[PDB]
Amino acid sequence: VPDYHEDIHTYLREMEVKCKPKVGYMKKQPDITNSMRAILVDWLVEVGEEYKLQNETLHLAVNYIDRFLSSMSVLRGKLQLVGTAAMLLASKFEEIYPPEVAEFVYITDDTYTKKQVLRMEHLVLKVLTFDLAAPTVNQFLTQYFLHQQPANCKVESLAMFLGELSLIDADPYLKYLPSVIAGAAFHLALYTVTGQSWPESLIRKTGYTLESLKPCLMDLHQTYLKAPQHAQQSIREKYKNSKYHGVSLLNPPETLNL
Amino acid sequence: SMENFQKVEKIGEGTYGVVYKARNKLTGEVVALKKIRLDTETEGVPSTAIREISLLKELNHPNIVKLLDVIHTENKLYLVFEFLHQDLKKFMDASALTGIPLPLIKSYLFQLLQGLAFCHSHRVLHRDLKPQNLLINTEGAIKLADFGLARAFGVPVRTYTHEVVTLWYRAPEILLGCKYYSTAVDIWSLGCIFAEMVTRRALFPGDSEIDQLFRIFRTLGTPDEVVWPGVTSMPDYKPSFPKWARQDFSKVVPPLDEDGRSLLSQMLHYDPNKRISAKAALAHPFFQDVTKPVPHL
Numbered sequence A: 001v002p003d004y005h006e007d008i009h010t011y012l013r014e015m016e017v018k019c020k021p022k023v024g025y026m027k028k029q030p031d032i033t034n035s036m037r038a039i040l041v042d043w044l045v046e047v048g049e050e051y052k053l054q055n056e057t058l059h060l061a062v063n064y065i066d067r068f069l070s071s072m073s074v075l076r077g078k079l080q081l082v083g084t085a086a087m088l089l090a091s092k093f094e095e096i097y098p099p100e101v102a103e104f105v106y107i108t109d110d111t112y113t114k115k116q117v118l119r120m121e122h123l124v125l126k127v128l129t130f131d132l133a134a135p136t137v138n139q140f141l142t143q144y145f146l147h148q149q150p151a152n153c154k155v156e157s158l159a160m161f162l163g164e165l166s167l168i169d170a171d172p173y174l175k176y177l178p179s180v181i182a183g184a185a186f187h188l189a190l191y192t193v194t195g196q197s198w199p200e201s202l203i204r205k206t207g208y209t210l211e212s213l214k215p216c217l218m219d220l221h222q223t224y225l226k227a228p229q230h231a232q233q234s235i236r237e238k239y240k241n242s243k244y245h246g247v248s249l250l251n252p253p254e255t256l257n258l
Numbered sequence B: 001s002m003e004n005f006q007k008v009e010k011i012g013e014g015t016y017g018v019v020y021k022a023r024n025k026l027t028g029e030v031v032a033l034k035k036i037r038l039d040t041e042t043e044g045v046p047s048t049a050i051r052e053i054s055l056l057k058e059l060n061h062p063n064i065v066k067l068l069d070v071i072h073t074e075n076k077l078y079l080v081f082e083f084l085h086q087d088l089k090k091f092m093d094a095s096a097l098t099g100i101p102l103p104l105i106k107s108y109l110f111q112l113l114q115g116l117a118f119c120h121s122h123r124v125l126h127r128d129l130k131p132q133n134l135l136i137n138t139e140g141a142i143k144l145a146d147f148g149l150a151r152a153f154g155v156p157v158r159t160y161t162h163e164v165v166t167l168w169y170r171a172p173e174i175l176l177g178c179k180y181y182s183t184a185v186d187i188w189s190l191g192c193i194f195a196e197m198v199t200r201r202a203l204f205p206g207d208s209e210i211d212q213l214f215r216i217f218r219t220l221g222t223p224d225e226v227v228w229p230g231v232t233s234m235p236d237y238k239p240s241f242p243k244w245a246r247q248d249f250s251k252v253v254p255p256l257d258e259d260g261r262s263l264l265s266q267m268l269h270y271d272p273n274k275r276i277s278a279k280a281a282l283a284h285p286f287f288q289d290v291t292k293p294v295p296h297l
């Protein structure tokens, strides 16, 4: 119904390509790795839950961290300071009531000072040149959900769970744009919950067919199937809640017949 | 960091910080500098500056003010903007006995809608449209400025800050407590400005929230279920509201032709789902002969 929704999706299709992190930055960091990043992200999911932050704020904070790490080498010991300043900035952009800085110092377990967090806030803003308005998988997903008549709330929670699982693993998801991940997640949740398939109105809206989503969907199907074995588990724990209709208790499809 | 700027005058306080007129001592450029004192033990960069800088960098458009630089000291934050001849407020007070000619009015309005539709198509709500935040140059352009209360909205929207829009320009869905609001609130603010240009005074110079509502009810009729399904169930709607009849627009805005009255009525519909969008408003017959006169300054 919403006026501007098509213009906005077209504009988001153009900004996700400009706001995208550099795909092999991790091979050039000298001290941090993909498994450290994964742990930071899993910690930010719990911080988001403790403070009742929107999921969008989580998705933004990750976008900021990956861009910051695209051009700044960071030691493993300051990696939480990057993360904390990013969640702080994503909260200020996106939340009606952002937790205050002392709240953020505190959840660091006092690892850092307020003065460090505020100076890391200024450096992140300088490296990202204040470009905080980025497109995230959450934003694509909430637009695609406008096409699934009547809305199915389990489909919606499960697509969000899968799109949040993609934030943990830079390898392979830093390869795909948010709109394509959102596409693969929506197909896989719809499929798992009702057996229905990426809709023809989404095909006309995005230009994406089931064949162009394939590469991303094979990865995400494997991520979903192996979720139980992954070292990071706060996402699965978050999505068992009734607010998310317990979708992380559902069984993944063993195959997708593609 | 500010050594190359010379202070010319203090212009005023806007959404946040202090705004000054200043000049670049090397190039001569006259700019507007918005100063924000930060400290440190406090909160870092406030959310209004983060939004205003980030969103104005996504808004390059002839009717939107230019942000030229950001100088982020340890102590203070300066936003450096192009300087225009003046704001629409001093111009409206810099026409109150004579009145801004109609062609100028229509030109400014057509421009403010092209600016606003650009904002909305880039998912930005302004949320503080009023004459002091609109800047005109000496060639006939007008621009949206002061994005300190702006925000990026989502598709579909969620709940946003309730304390938004300066009270005279504030739409009835915020005044009545609707959980959600979206692009329609900016359009309501522009219909209030269009009418103020034409008749020479604020349309709804409410003092308080209840005063602002009852001023909109007396001119436009107390909304009921025929014009706005669900108004009678809104959070702050009261069945004991007085029931006023709607006024003819030949009395609300006498100088307007009927193309003007119809577009002003489409911008002030009560139901945000019936209020005209900025983009649909650009196709209105009122603008069929729009031209671009030069203000008299």
Ligand SMILES: Nc1nc(OCC2CCCCC2)c2nc[nH]c2n1
Pocket (backbone or CB within 6 Å): B011, B012, B013, B014, B019, B031, B032, B065, B081, B082, B083, B084, B085, B086, B087, B132, B133, B135, B145
């Ligand atoms: N001429 C002018 N005035 C401004 O601010 C108006 C005042 C009005 C009252 C509130 C503070 C700002 C500007 N901002 C950017 N360019 C500007 N140019």
